[PDB]
Each structure stands twice: as structure tokens, then as C-alpha cells.
Design a protein. Sequence first.
Length: 441
Amino acid sequence: EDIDVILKKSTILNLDINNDIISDISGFNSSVITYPDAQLVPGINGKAIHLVNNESSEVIVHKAMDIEYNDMFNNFTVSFWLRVPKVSASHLEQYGTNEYSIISSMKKHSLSIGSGWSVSLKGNNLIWTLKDSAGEVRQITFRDLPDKFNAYLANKWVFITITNDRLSSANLYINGVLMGSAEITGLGAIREDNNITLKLDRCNNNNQYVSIDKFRIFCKALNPKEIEKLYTSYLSITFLRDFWGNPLRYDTEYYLIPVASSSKDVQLKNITDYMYLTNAPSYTNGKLNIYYRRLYNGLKFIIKRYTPNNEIDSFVKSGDFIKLYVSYNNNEHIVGYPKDGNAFNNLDRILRVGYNAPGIPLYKKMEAVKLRDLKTYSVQLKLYDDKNASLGLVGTHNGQIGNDPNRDILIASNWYFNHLKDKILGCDWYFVPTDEGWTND
Ligand SMILES: CC(=O)N[C@H]1[C@H]([C@H](O)[C@H](O)CO)O[C@](O)(C(=O)O)C[C@@H]1O
């Protein structure tokens, strides 16, 4: 059969958010009951569930009749997108050993053992736990990476898939790739609750919160092939994304960082002059084994609309035409290339900030596009001249201008169009907005 078919037909639960209401679109018609404080925020494709630390934030699904016991002995997969702020060093010390769940099928203190499955978080650990009615227990504990800029639980939307083979293993996937496993033969009857509960349980930190989207369950163990398809199916190409996976926006400030050189910030020569990469400061913690380049230094960039013309859509769309500005000192300075302005031999046009020489036209119309790399939250920008000719994608070039040090200078180039299939490319950018989910220790 076809992957898309298989995925469809094995779906037994699918939580869709349409019209600001959470329901089950799988066909089974499971009763969803959202409590007063489950929030609704921006998502991978739509709005997503956002849970805070309290008894009223919660979404409960009461299994329909038909699916009551599909995980008792049989195979099943759980999948969902998950987003979890980056734990601060301080919260690691004080709450590091506080394992709380966020999604569970296990009725707790009541006298029903806890039989069932649970998804839970413990410092920087993501854990899946299975428990049969005799109380036997199998667990995959996934230990996030130490480098927080590149980790799965340091604020970005990530896609989780856990498959359960009762004659063999239980595997845990992150963004389509195996991140952990455990052998689960030796489990007997999974005897859960009739409710699947999304909600922070027993979490000791009043501020903790997490976001979940697309909560789905299949009555089969998905194979890696199916999983990558599942995973890329939610990755809609028409809407651009910020570094955290949320909708790219007009009129908000973003720090630019090059995917190819993610230790680098952009910096500005001077108003009217050029831009270049610099090294991003540091944060390290041997004792907690966590490090990351620090965010929020460098240039602030704001995207404006060039035409008005769709409606107030706050989100940028691939192909929208835009104007880029730098937000340096409460003033706003446009980014462009002045006609016949300094460029490198091969014709790499150097970008200027705030250029205003009387009499010289300034090319400055850009198009925001996604040309490569569907799973990275990165964007590409293409610059045109007044005749709608390409001055090519924005990226960098190494060299010197005057007596200035050798630098990786921001420029526009048509070169990049010939290398769109590479792994790593100089025109790929990360648009980072400041966020409560990430504060630099
Ligand atoms: C010393 C010098 O050449 N400085 C800059 C000049 C002048 O500011 C400009 O010529 C005034 O009209 O601009 C360039 O030539 C230009 O237009 O790209 C590049 C150069 O960085």
C-alpha cells in the first residue's frame, strides 16, 4: 500500500485545532475536553497547545469505545510536535531531578497501579515509560545534547515519534531519526486509564510550561520510512519560520545568524557602510555539561512589506517581496546595494546599511524564499534591481575593503543559485527573535 494511505488508515487519534477548538479528526470521534487554562499559541502548521503549571491547564481525551484497549497487547506509535524552553543553569540545579510528565495514559493515585504509557521530562532528559498491570517497567531515557543551540529541548519545535513493538522494541525518534531504544518483551497487559491526559503532572517549578501539537496515535509500530514521511508532511513550504520554528513575522526584530557559520553574529561597519560576521560570545558550564554560543548580540533586523497586498497577514510568505531594515539605535536604516557600488570581482554585490548618497539609486527590493533545506528553520533572501533583475541571494564573501581587516562581508550573489543542493550553504539564514524560552545564563 502507499505510505500516505498506511499513515491515514492506522490513525486512531489525531488532535486538530480548527476554529480555536481542539478535536479528534482521526474518524474515531474521541471526546476532547479542554480545561480553562490550556493555551493556544503559534505552531508548526497552525496553532498549538500550550500548557502551564497548574491544575486548570489541561486537555483530556476520553478514548472512544472502539480504541479503549488498542495498546493492551498490540503495537502502537505516539507522535507529536513538542517545544520546551531551554532550562536555565539555575533550574537544572534546583529542579534537575524533578521528573514530571506532560502526556499520560496512566491513572495515578486512585489504586490502579499506573499501568500505561507516559511522556515525561527530567532536567534535560526526555523519557518514555511503559508499565504493565503487574507493574513491570521499560523506559527509554533520551539525554539531550549539551550544545543548546543545537539541542532538541532548548526551545525549538521538534517532532517526536515513539513506536512500540511488543514482540521487540520501543523506539524513540526525534525529527525522523532514532535517538533511543529499549527492548520491551517481558511486558504483559498494559492497563491504562480511559483518558489520555496532556498536562504537567507533579512538576515542581511554577514557571515551567511546554507546547505540544498534532498529538496523534497509530495502531501500528511505524517504520523509519513512514516516520520520515509523517515528519515531512507537517513541513509546509509556503510560510517562513523563525529560528524557533514559529511563523516568520513582519514588523518584528530578529537577530541574523548564518546557518553555515552558526558561531557568528552580523555586525555593522558604520551607517552607510557594510556588514560582516563576528564571533558570538560564550557560555559554558562544565559542572552541568551545557554550553551554547550566546544569543541576542549583533544586528537587529526588521522585515517590512514592499506592497500591502494580501491582507494583514502578520506572517511572511515564501515569495513575498519585502524591504529589510537594520534597527540600530532606535532609528531604522534600509539594507540595499547602491547602483555601481563596490562589489567583488566575480560581481558579489556588497550590501550597504542606510546608504543615502544623493543621486544614486539604491536597489533594495528583496524576496523572502525557502529554496533549500525543508527541516531547518532557515530563510533565503534574494535582492533585485529596479528592472526586476536578480542581484542574487544574500550571503557573505571573504576579503577586505580598504585597509580594514580580512572579513566575511555581507553581499548579494547569483552564485548561490548554482549550488542549491549542497549540504551547507552561505546564503542560509536564521532569524532569531528574543524569547522567554531562551535567556542566556
Ligand atoms: C572610500 C570609498 O570608496 N568608500 C565607499 C564609496 C563612497 O562612499 C561613494 O563612492 C560615495 O559616492 O562607496 C563605494 O564606492 C560604493 O558606492 O559602493 C564603496 C566604498 O566603500
